[PDB]
Design a protein around this ligand. Structure first.
Ligand SMILES: [Zn+2]
Ligand SMILES: [Zn+2]
Ligand SMILES: [Zn+2]
Ligand SMILES: [Zn+2]
Lengths: 299, 299
């Protein structure tokens, strides 16, 4: 069978802490002797309208930051602002610190989010960095500081920290060095996401998953070319397909005996004719939040 | 926002072990001094055509069972068959054993699956016990023994262990005492799932989630009665709605200001008119794998 699957979240659960500074409380990421959290923990609600973060951070010293792991306080002994994240140096290294790296991921790639509330993990789900650098997530109040990650079996690649819901109801945040994905700033003002487009190479990987799992009704007797496939992609706001994308689809092509362009042709007719009320892998729409790697691990 | 969300899987990752007995290797659940796994670990491929499990298990002693946690062997010192599960008593209690209970869940309830391969957690996803007591999962070879669970913040309720893919491609397994959900037996023969029906109370909870999250186009100016709502339910293979279901939807009703029957009326027109190509919460079909409790925790 085939489902949207997150990585196991244990190695990250042991890294989540609660951070308070004033009445504002959000989640933090404790790795070695550093806790990472979004800087707007130092902001009141009024502050968020137009924050001068350097100035706000000057009125704050170490003892203003309340870092808690379960029922234990960690003594802050140094604070820094790296872009939009606060680095709270503390006295004790996290004993549960896995091997980890910080990676900025690319639009179209997927990661797992450990959704947290006041330092407590509440749930885990898989999601994708939309092309317009937003994510469609699930972030209640106090979920700020929740991190996105991938696990390549030994170490945790941290790639996301949640900072904001935007007026569209969609989600924005940073890498773990504090740089926003996309044009967003951690301020409570109007901010456009811009047009979001379907992750074409992912959609194709899904169809390949479908074929592997027995759903192959959408298979056609036509074929197509890449440029003419892309002429329909632009029409239906799909990312243009490249030869790289064709190569990544290679192993799925080599398993299904279905050439990439032949799949591009069936995708073409689904886009120009719709899906007629039928489903692929139990979805009535074209699914773009599985990378070719995601599909491969499930097959 | 709103996504299908699994529980944090750390407390379960530390319980997964690998079990071998012959060339057959699957996953096990190590809690206190007991490892639990599906009994057909004692079966060859030939055995599975018509296994006499008591007889097969007699030819097996303790030293035939290879129980491994990462790179450590656990000495088996007693073996039992409880229904369709093997209870491998071992010498060392699992140090990471959380507080846990074994619960048999009810059709329509949801749980998280920690999908594993040879004792290693590979991913986690949320799913529902379909009314016909199957689950639509993601189970590669060697995923047998993977467990389903809920976490009620302190203890892990284990409710599922995967035993079988059926000829439909759908999934069947047992509670942790070894009793199949549904009419299925751990034998490689033809086995019908029977007609699967939509989990009506869940679908309604989803619409309530949708309303809360801003999608409310499906709201109508009609209303309806419960029996006439159910007269359309039977037509579209939906579980009949009861007063209990209405009560569970209560808090969502009290939050949305939308009476349950008014929602049942909008559901009625979606079932008899379809969804016209639009989406609710980004789905082009009616979603039934969120309980009212699932929706409530996300709101
Ligand atoms: Zn925030
Ligand atoms: Zn690594
Ligand atoms: Zn098996
Ligand atoms: Zn409990």
């Amino acid at each position: 069978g085939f489902r949207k699957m997150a990585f196991p979240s244990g190695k990250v659960e042991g890294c989540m802490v609660q951070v308070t500074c004033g009445t504002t409380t959000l989640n933090g990421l404790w790795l070695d002797d550093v806790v990472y959290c979004p800087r707007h923990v130092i902001c009141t609600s009024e502050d968020m309208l137009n924050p001068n973060y350097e100035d706000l951070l000057i009125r704050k010293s170490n003892h203003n930051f309340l870092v808690q792991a379960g029922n234990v306080q960690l003594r802050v002994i140094g604070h820094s602002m790296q872009n939009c994240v606060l680095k709270l140096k503390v006295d004790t290294a996290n004993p549960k610190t896995p091997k980890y790296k910080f990676v900025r991921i690319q639009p179209g790639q997927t990661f797992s989010v450990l959704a947290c509330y006041n330092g407590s993990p509440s749930g885990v789900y898989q999601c994708a960095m939309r092309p317009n650098f937003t994510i469609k997530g699930s972030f209640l109040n106090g979920s700020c500081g929740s991190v996105g990650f991938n696990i390549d079996y030994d170490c945790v690649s941290f790639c996301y920290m949640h900072h904001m819901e935007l007026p569209t109801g969609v989600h924005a945040g940073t890498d773990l060095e504090g740089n926003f994905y996309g044009p967003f700033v951690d301020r409570q003002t109007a901010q456009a996401a811009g047009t979001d487009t379907t992750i074409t190479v992912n959609v194709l990987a899904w169809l390949y998953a479908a074929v592997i799992n027995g759903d192959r009704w959408f298979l056609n007797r036509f074929t197509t070319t890449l440029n003419d496939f892309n002429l329909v992609a632009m029409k239906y706001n799909y990312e243009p397909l490249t030869q790289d994308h064709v190569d990544i689809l290679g192993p799925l092509s080599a398993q299904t005996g279905i050439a990439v362009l032949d799949m591009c042709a069936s995708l073409k007719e689904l886009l120009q004719n719709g899906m007629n009320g039928r489903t692929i892998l139990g979805s009535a729409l074209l699914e773009d939040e599985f990378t070719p790697f995601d599909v491969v691990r499930q097959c």
